[PDB]
Structure formats: C-alpha cells, structure tokens
C-alpha cells in the first residue's frame with residue numbers, strides 16, 4: 001500500500017503511464033481500461049488508486065464514494081504572487097465553436113445539425129450543451145436533436161457514434177479514449193475543423209492552442225482564428241476573443257479522484273511526483289515530463305502548469321458546485337447509467 | 349429513466365409543458381401530438397408516460413391497457429374539511445346550454461338544429477348527449493341528427509366539422525386541440541356565444557366561469573348568465589342556477605392515465621408536483637402554477653384544487669362506473685374509432 005496504482009484510459013495513456021512508473025522508482029504503478037467508467041470501477045474494486053478526470057466523470061466517481069484530491073491549474077492572469085500549488089483555481093469556459101464559413105448557424109438553429117463532442121458525460125463536450133438543449137426543448141430526446149454527432153461512449157450503432165471515425169484502421173469506433181480520432185477536447189475540434197460536424201463543444205483553451213500555428217499537427221497548423229466563430233446563448237455570433245460573453249457556462253477544472261482512505265497518501269505522492277516530473281521539475285525535460293504528451297493531452301491536460309490543493313476537504317458536490325451538480329442531475333433524469341445504478345445501492 | 353414524459357395535445361398545451369419541465373428540473377418532460385388519441389398511442393409505445401384525459405378518452409386508453417393514476421378534484425360544498433387529495437371525487441354535470449333569446453328550442457326540438465360539442469368521444473360534448481339521442485331516435489344516424497355541428501375530432505370533410513372555425517388563419521379546422529376556436533369546454537361555449545351554434549354540450553361549471561366577467565377573454569368578458577338557459581330531458585328550460593335539476597348526466601372527473609408499469613412513479617412525481625406548483629404550491633405563481641393556463645384548461649382544468657388519490661389500483665371500468673361504460677359501449681356500436689378497433693383484442 002506504499003505505491004499509487006494510476007489508472008490509464010487507452011494504450012497511448014498506457015505507454016505515457018509506464019514511462020512515469022519506470023522513472024518514479026515504482027513510487028507510481030499503472031493499471032489500464034478501455035473507458036474512464038471502467039477505470040473508476042477499478043479504483044472502487046481497489047485494483048487502482050487514482051486518476052485525473054473531467055468534472056462530469058468526477059460526478060460519476062463522486063456518486064460511487066470517491067473524493068477529489070488535487071485540481072489541474074493553468075496559466076493565470078491574476079494573483080501571480082501565490083505559488084502554482086497555492087494559487088486558487090479559475091475554471092475553464094465551455095463554449096460552442098462553429099466555422100465562420102457556416103452562415104445562419106446560431107444557438108436557435110442547432111436542431112437537426114451535426115455535432116462534435118469531447119465525449120458522453122464530459123462537462124464541456126456533453127453535460128453543459130445537452131443539459132441546456134434538453135432544458136430549453138423540455139425533451140429528454142437529446143439522442144434525436146443533432147441529425148448526426150460524434151460522442152465517444154454513446155451506443156456505437158446510434159447516430160451519436162455515426163460521425164466518429166475510430167483509429168487509423170477505423171476499428172473500435174466511438175471508444176472514449178485517445179484511440180478515437182475525434183476523442184477528447186482536441187478530437188471534437190479536429191471534427192469541426194475537418195468539417196465532419198457543423199458545431200463542436202469544447203473549452204476556449206482548445207481554440208487558441210490549435211489555431212494560428214500554435215499546433216504542429218497536420219490538421220491544426222494552417223488553421224486561422226477568423227475562420228471560427230462562437231455561438232452565445234443570446235443567439236448572437238461573436239469572435240473567439242469575446243469568450244467571456246460567448247461561453248455556455250463556467251466548468252470546474254479537471255481533478256484527481258481516489259478512495260476516501262487513500263486520498264492524503266496520493267495527495268503527498270503526487271505533490272512530490274510533480275516537483276520531480278512537473279512543468280518545473282528536476283527531471284523535465286531531462287528524464288520524464290508528466291504534463292506533456294504530444295497534443296494527445298494524455299493522463300493530464302498539456303495546458304496544466306501544476307496540480308493544486310483544495311481549501312478544506314471538499315465533497316465531489318462542493319468542488320463541482322451546487323449549480324453544476326444540479327445541471328448534471330437534471331440531464332441524468334433522461335438516461336440510465338449502469339455504473340451510477342450499481343454505486344447507488346452498492347456504496348449507499 | 350426517472351423523468352416523467354407528459355403528453356401535450358397541441359402547441360398551447362406543449363408551451364405550458366416545456367415550462368413545467370424547466371421549473372420541475374426535468375422531473376417532467378414533453379411529448380406533443382395534434383390529437384389526444386395520438387397522445388394515447390405515444391403512451392402505449394413508451395414515447396410519453398402519462399397525460400390528463402376526459403372520461404371518454406379514459407375508455408379509449410382503458411381499452412388499450414392504460415390505467416388511471418389520479419383524478420382531478422374540485423372545490424366541494426359537502427365535507428369541506430378533508431385534505432383535497434383524500435376528499436372523494438364529487439363528479440360533475442353534463443348540461444345542454446342554449447341562448448334564452450332562441451324560442452321554442454327544447455330537448456325535443458333539437459332535431460335538425462346546429463350543435464357545439466367539446467370534441468368527439470368526450471363525455472359532456474359527445475358520449476352522453478349523442479348516447480341518449482340515439483337511444484331516443486332508435487336510429488344510429490347521429491351523423492345526420494344536427495343540420496351542421498362543430499365536433500372537433502370528427503371527419504373534417506363532414507357536417508360535424510362544418511361549424512369548426514380553426515386557428516387564427518382558419519387552418520387545422522376541427523383538429524381536437526385548443527388551436528381550434530371551439531375545441532374543449534371553453535370552445536363549445538364561445539361557439540354558442542357567437543351564435544355559430546344553437547346548443548352547446550358542456551359541463552355545469554363552464555357557464556359560470558365565462559359569464560359575469562369571471563373571464564377577461566374578449567369573447568367572454570361581456571357575457572351575461574341571464575342570456576343562457578339549460579335544456580332538460582323533461583323537455584323544459586331553466587336558468588344556470590337550476591343545473592342540479594336541468595343536467596343531462598353525472599360525468600366522472602378528468603384523470604391522469606399511464607401504462608401499468610409506470611403508474612406508481614407518475615403518481616409519486618405528480619403528488620410532489622402539485623405540492624410545489626399546485627393551488628397552494630410554494631412556487632405558485634412565484635415560478636409556475638400547474639392548474640392555471642388562461643381559462644384555456646391546458647393539460648389540466650383550471651377549476652382543479654388538486655389531483656386526488658383513488659381507491660386501490662382501479663380499472664377504467666371501476667373509475668368510470670359500470671353505468672357510464674355501458675352507455676359509451678352502446679353509442680360505440682353505432683360507429684367505430686381506429687384505436688378501439690386496433691386494441692379490442694386486449695380488453696376481450
């Protein structure tokens with residue numbers, strides 16, 4: 001019980017994990033599953049200790065009795081005195097990104113359109129958009145709102161998994177891991193960019209990092225921030241710059257979860273692991289870099305400066321926030337989750 | 349699937365249902381159909397969960413296996429000090445309303461006159477009046493009794509839809525939906541008010557709520573109780589006050605139907621929904637009033653205090669009463685409906 005078994009989602013995450021493991025000196029070891037829901041199950045089973053999760057998956061984890069340990073933190077514009085770990089979190093902005101070339105496409109026209117999602121149950125990609133749509137229509141029929149979509153983790157045979165491409169060989173299409181071409185923050189934007197979907201739900205940070213040659217990726221190099229507009233709730237269209245007025249909602253930062261018992265242990269091991277392999281670590285870029293994965297945003301986001309502590313001990317509720325928790329719960333009235341079902345009585 | 353999908357009949361009823369959704373936090377969602385029979389079918393397919401139905405519709409939905417869940421209960425004279433939900437259902441009064449200014453018009457001179465009906469297969473508008481007329485004439489030719497009628501839900505290329513006026517632009521003529529100017533209880537009255545029809549088949553409560561400026565509607569604000577008289581099986585006429593002695597029948601109250609598998613859940617959800625959004629509901633009118641539309645009796649009748657419980661788990665037979673079932677049955681031998689033919693095997 002001295003080690004920390006880290007759970008990896010996909011093979012790409014696996015290799016990056018194993019590396020971390022070798023260099024750590026087995027202070028950190030690697031478990032793997034196809035999906036994040038599988039990975040969380042391991043943590044519950046006790047075949048793994050922790051992982052870093054979108055807010056949405058934090059909700060699923062949190063309903064299964066796991067707790068948040070450290071939060072992802074990124075380049076701030078204020079309170080620059082406080083150390084990265086001591087600096088408070090801000091929380092990314094969930095947006096709706098459309099091609100400027102596409103005309104007449106406002107928030108009120110998305111009905112019967114094509115969509116790109118980070119994945120199912122994720123905060124930007126799914127919970128915030130589908131929450132709002134589902135609420136405005138007063139319909140739990142989100143499975144018929146977009147004419148066609150890519151939402152890794154949906155029913156592979158449904159129209160939410162239609163526009164999904166798979167890996168290089170087009171196998172395991174719609175899996176919610178990096179192996180899916182359009183998976184995660186990057187994937188959703190690549191979908192919109194290669195004009196597979198008319199809209200993509202990501203965070204602004206995804207926009208700025210993949211346009212104006214901020215990416216050497218063969219899909220993101222030639223990209224130009226004027227060929228992309230932001231759908232706002234008013235109905236107006238605004239440029240990427242006005243994201244403070246054209247954002248769908250404020251997203252709780254990705255966080256590490258673990259069992260209540262092993263939280264403090266992992267807290268410690270990780271603060272030391274980031275001091276070594278972090279953005280400013282003795283062995284970055286010497287041995288191993290924990291916050292860099294070649295635009296695959298594996299294990300952590302690439303935009304992660306460090307991991308930070310949380311004031312007091314926070315419930316999955318307090319972390320995400322009373323309002324967002326209410327938004328997910330309401331959207332989850334429209335679907336049936338095997339995991340959430342099991343945990344509901346198993347951890348009661 | 350904790351959400352309860354309400355079935356809304358027409359776009360007005362759906363606009364309230366969307367509202368219901370947004371305030372109930374998707375504990376309730378919307379499904380829409382032009383007609384009530386169409387909405388009964390959705391409930392059979394599980395595309396919706398439940399809706400509030402006139403007694404005659406409850407025969408239709410009964411025949412097709414749906415059960416009753418909660419009955420509308422109104423302000424009572426007798427036993428005023430029992431909790432609305434536990435106070436027994438006191439029935440309501442099926443009455444024939446004519447303008448006083450029409451002379452020699454009696455129950456026994458109705459032949460070849462003009463009629464307004466709430467809609468086809470409803471209890472006050474159709475099941476009782478036409479049930480008796482056939483029984484008196486000895487003929488099954490109710491399609492030829494009145495010269496012309498409005499009877500939304502009939503053949504829109506027949507005499508029974510000849511007086512049905514439509515929406516604002518006069519489209520959707522005779523559709524059994526609030527967009528038809530003369531649909532429902534209100535509509536039957538407005539049809540007799542504007543002297544488009546010689547008689548109107550409504551419930552007692554319809555005259556009071558639309559005469560003596562008890563309604564602010566342009567058509568109803570100036571209506572006077574003294575200008576209307578109630579026809580009797582006596583062959584006699586009387587004013588609105590003698591309704592207990594000039595009424596065609598005792599109608600079972602409107603009620604919520606659902607599929608047997610989803611009743612208990614629908615009952616629960618609703619008991620709570622009246623609690624928050626009912627007559628004395630904390631969120632009335634601070635957020636949403638469930639038994640208020642605009643004299644438009646949308647989703648529920650506006651004269652509803654609370655949806656009340658029933659005695660055990662009743663059937664359409666028990667809740668309508670063996671008398672009313674046999675009267676319906678004998679009228680239905682005269683003319684078939686699609687849904688009754690389609691479902692006959694279930695009840696046989």
Ligand SMILES: *[C@@H]1O[C@H](CO)[C@@H](O[C@@H]2O[C@H](CO)[C@@H](O)[C@H](O[C@@H]3O[C@H](CO)[C@@H](O)[C@H](O)[C@@H]3O)[C@H]2NC(C)=O)[C@H](O)[C@H]1NC(C)=O
Nearest residue numbers: 476479480482483484486670671672673674675676678679
């Ligand atoms: C006129 O319509 C009325 C209703 O509008 C019909 O009444 C029912 O008709 C049947 C005959 O098919 C009668 O038997 C029903 O009454 C009796 O109810 C007792 C209960 O005390 C039963 O035990 C009897 O077996 C019997 O069914 C009668 N319903 C009522 C409430 O009286 C009637 O048939 C119809 N008549 C004509 C000529 O059209």
Ligand SMILES: *[C@@H]1O[C@H](CO)[C@@H](O[C@@H]2O[C@H](CO)[C@@H](O[C@@H]3O[C@H](CO)[C@@H](O)[C@H](O)[C@@H]3O)[C@H](O)[C@H]2NC(C)=O)[C@H](O)[C@H]1NC(C)=O
Nearest residue numbers: 075076077078093203204205206208209214241242243244
């Ligand atoms: C939506 O996401 C984008 C992308 O992350 C945000 O832009 C980023 O803003 C930060 C500062 O707040 C920039 O960092 C800067 O670095 C220099 C030194 O290198 C420092 O001295 C400055 O004070 C500044 O902090 C960062 O470069 C920038 N990233 C890119 C690639 O442009 C954007 O703010 C987000 N939008 C909203 C409305 O929040």
Ligand SMILES: *[C@@H]1O[C@H](CO)[C@@H](O[C@@H]2O[C@H](CO)[C@@H](O[C@@H]3O[C@H](CO)[C@@H](O)[C@H](O)[C@@H]3O)[C@H](O)[C@H]2NC(C)=O)[C@H](O)[C@H]1NC(C)=O
Nearest residue numbers: 350370371372373374375376616617620621623624625631
């Ligand atoms: C929509 O969703 C549910 C429908 O069940 C509602 O939440 C439930 O509401 C009750 C409040 O009446 C919650 O707490 C209760 O407290 C009383 C004590 O005062 C206690 O006797 C009850 O057993 C219960 O603990 C209840 O926990 C809650 N259920 C859940 C799972 O959250 C909600 O109010 C509905 N909202 C709307 C706007 O319709």
Ligand SMILES: *[C@@H]1O[C@H](CO)[C@@H](O[C@@H]2O[C@H](CO)[C@@H](O[C@@H]3O[C@H](CO)[C@@H](O)[C@H](O)[C@@H]3O)[C@H](O)[C@H]2NC(C)=O)[C@H](O)[C@H]1NC(C)=O
Nearest residue numbers: 423424425426428441552553554556557562590591592593
């Ligand atoms: C025929 O229809 C009218 C309208 O539905 C009924 O008149 C209603 O009479 C009831 C008594 O049963 C009245 O309720 C009372 O309300 C007062 C306060 O307004 C309260 O102090 C009393 O204790 C009582 O509960 C009700 O106001 C009245 N409604 C209207 C709009 O006039 C009548 O009951 C029906 N007639 C028959 C023969 O069933």
Ligand SMILES: *[C@@H]1O[C@H](CO)[C@@H](O[C@@H]2O[C@H](CO)[C@@H](O)[C@H](O)[C@H]2NC(C)=O)[C@H](O)[C@H]1NC(C)=O
Nearest residue numbers: 131132135136326327330367370371634635636
């Ligand atoms: C769903 O959308 C509706 C509005 O379209 C939101 O409900 C309104 O919110 C305000 C502020 O909380 C309430 O006071 C109003 O009464 C509501 N207006 C209407 C017209 O119902 C609702 O908050 C939205 N749901 C979510 C999860 O954001």
Ligand SMILES: [Fe+3]
Nearest residue numbers: 054055123124
């Ligand atoms: Fe996220």
Ligand SMILES: [Fe+3]
Nearest residue numbers: 402403471472
């Ligand atoms: Fe009725």
